[PDB]
Amino acid sequence: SMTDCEFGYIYRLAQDYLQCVLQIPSKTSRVLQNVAFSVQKEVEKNLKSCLDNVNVVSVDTARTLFNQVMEKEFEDGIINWGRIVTIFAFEGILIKKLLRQQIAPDVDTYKEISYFVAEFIMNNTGEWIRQNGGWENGFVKKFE
Amino acid sequence: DMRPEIWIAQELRRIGDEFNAYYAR
Prior knowledge:
Chain A is mostly helical.
């Protein structure tokens, strides 16, 4: 289906972002990385008090927290491209807290964070993204 | 107890909406 290809596109964006965050060596993706990184930096400083007290011990606990935060962020019924950027900024925050405190480090299984991020974006914001220009004409033209 | 879901969601929502206003086209 079209949703399969749409899912893979978003998954690649989320993977790229995580590789950018960890500095592990496309246009839309580069634009996303630039804006999400400055979102993430601001968020990490505004939330030091909160975040210093958050344990991200596994991919499972990262997922639970991601899902709870996503539910609260979007419960007012508003989707926009700026909020979509914050999903990526937040996954970047989860990936840092995870490997900061992960006891047996595993970078490959961070595919898994990218996957549940893509699942959220696709199932909850995917139809909005389509009605709002897609990544290539909605997102890029706005944030480039 | 602390509800980090609320503290984080609140900040992401705020900055998401600001950034939404700061970029256009």
